[PDB]
């Protein structure tokens, strides 16, 4: 199916304790494969998946260089943000960046990203057409003008349609066994009595990949939306994910409810009944 490669970087200033910490991670779909931590002793891009260890010296030198340069860039970008908003140098601030691309089953471009966030809020994001920017406020509008003049959108466009797609294609092959697989969820259902009159039915989804899934409840066939409790899909640690959905059923009516599971590891949606 369709795949993605994402890079997430986080810069956090620490006034009085030196330079801001820069941490970056790389993802292919839901599998992390690299990391960079400015505080680490290695000062190198490090492997975080087996299928990336095969890359030669050139790769690890170039990636390191590129991420370290992104480290310094965000470093200056935090100081600029400070100036724009005229904020105190006593306050800690955050700067996040995400970039990457989406491909299809044939491995050709489908979508691209290049966006920033300051203190948790959108700052500037490259639009879908990869030619224009959306500046969140008047501080970002100053960056937007400068980037339009410097043809920044053209540079990232080329990376997102060229290098990003190619690197992703290269990874999907090298990690064929890992990244190109789907683990169907193991599904079952648990029952938990609160009182004499009610009872909780819980629907489980275990050991699935990728993380995208959908758990729904139905009674007699209708959809139990505003009464279903849902948790965030969560990693198991082994590379698979977990999730559950629960509804509070009147005692003696447990057989009215069915659990519905949608995962791309499942040819067709499943239907669990208690």
């Amino acid at each position: 199916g369709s795949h993605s490669m994402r890079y997430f970087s986080t810069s956090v200033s620490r006034p009085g304790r030196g330079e801001p910490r820069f941490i970056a991670v790389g993802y292919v779909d839901d599998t992390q494969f690299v990391r960079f931590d400015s505080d680490a002793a290695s000062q190198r891009m490090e492997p975080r998946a087996p299928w990336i260890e095969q890359e030669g010296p050139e790769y690890w030198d170039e990636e390191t260089g590129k991420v370290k340069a992104h480290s310094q860039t965000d470093r200056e970008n935090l100081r600029i943000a400070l100036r724009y908003y005229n904020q105190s140098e006593a306050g800690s601030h955050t700067l996040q960046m995400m970039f990457g691309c989406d491909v299809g089953s044939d491995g050709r471009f489908l979508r691209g990203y290049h966006q920033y966030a300051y203190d948790g809020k959108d700052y500037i994001a490259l639009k879908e057409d990869l030619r224009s920017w959306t500046a969140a406020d008047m501080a970002a509008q100053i960056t937007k003008r400068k980037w339009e003049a410097a043809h920044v959108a053209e540079q990232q466009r080329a990376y997102l349609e060229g290098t990003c797609v190619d690197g992703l294609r290269r990874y999907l092959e090298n990690g064929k066994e890992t990244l190109q697989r789907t683990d169907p969820p193991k599904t079952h259902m648990t029952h938990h009595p609160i009182s004499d009159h009610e009872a909780t039915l819980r629907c489980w989804a275990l050991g699935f990949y990728p993380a995208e899934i959908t758990l729904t409840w139905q009674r007699d066939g209708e959809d139990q939306t505003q009464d279903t409790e849902l948790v965030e899909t969560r990693p198991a640690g082994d590379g698979t994910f977990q999730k559950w959905a629960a509804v509070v059923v009147p005692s003696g009516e447990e057989q009215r409810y069915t659990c519905h599971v949608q995962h791309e590891g499942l040819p067709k949606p499943l239907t669990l009944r208690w």
């Binding site: 890079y7 790389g26 891009m45 170039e62 990636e63 260089g65 590129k66 991420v67 340069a69 992104h70 860039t73 200056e76 970008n77 600029i80 943000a81 724009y84 970039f99 290049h114 700052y123 500037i124 501080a139 100053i142 960056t143 400068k146 980037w147 410097a150 920044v152 540079q155 990232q156 990376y159 290098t163 990003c164 190619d166 690197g167 290269r170």
Partner: peptide
């Protein structure tokens, strides 16, 4: 593959 360096900060 990481995006090549860019300057022209904010």
């Amino acid at each position: 593959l990481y995006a090549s360096p860019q300057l022209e900060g904010f």
